[PDB]
């Protein structure tokens, strides 16, 4: 089963929180400090945002640390809003025991640029509880490596 705002808000660590970030199911990531953009870092705390570029992919780091317990899964989804303006979220999932920011991808399928504000909420994620606790569960900036 899904965890309501009021189990969301007494069971997952979520630091800053916003009040208004909380919805009847889930929570609305903002974005954070750091993007990273066509080989670059972005400091998006310092610039006030980011533009993703059209037709261009972007790492961005959520504002908020979020810590699970072992027995909830973690499932993001985009914002309608930026939807509809062209980006597609490309999402893993949060793993039961997660504990830190996440590094989101977002993909711009427009022609035209995007941009977001920091601090903006632009991806909800929802918590979904484990039928019993996993046997093996599962950090403040972009994790940038690659395989
Ligand atoms: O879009 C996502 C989805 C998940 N995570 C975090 C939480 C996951 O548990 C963890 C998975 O990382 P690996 O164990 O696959 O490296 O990454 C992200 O940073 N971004």
């Given amino acids: 089963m899904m965890l309501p705002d009021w189990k969301i808000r007494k069971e997952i660590l979520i630091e800053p929180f916003n009040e208004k970030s909380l919805q009847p199911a889930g929570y609305d990531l903002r974005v954070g400090k750091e993007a990273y953009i066509n080989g670059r870092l972005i400091n998006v705390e310092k610039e006030g945002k980011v533009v993703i570029p059209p037709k261009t992919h972007a790492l961005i780091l959520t504002l908020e640390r979020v810590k699970l317990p072992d027995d909830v899964m973690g499932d993001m989804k985009l914002?309608?809003?930026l939807a509809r303006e062209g980006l597609l979220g490309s999402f893993?999932?949060?793993?039961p025991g997660w504990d830190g920011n996440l590094t989101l991808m977002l993909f711009n399928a427009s022609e035209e640029p995007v941009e977001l504000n920091y601090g903006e909420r632009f991806v909800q994620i929802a918590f979904i509880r484990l039928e019993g606790p996993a046997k093996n569960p599962y950090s403040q900036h972009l994790v940038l490596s690659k395989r």
């Fill in 92 to 95: 893993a999932w949060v793993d």
């Fill in 79 to 81: 914002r309608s809003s």
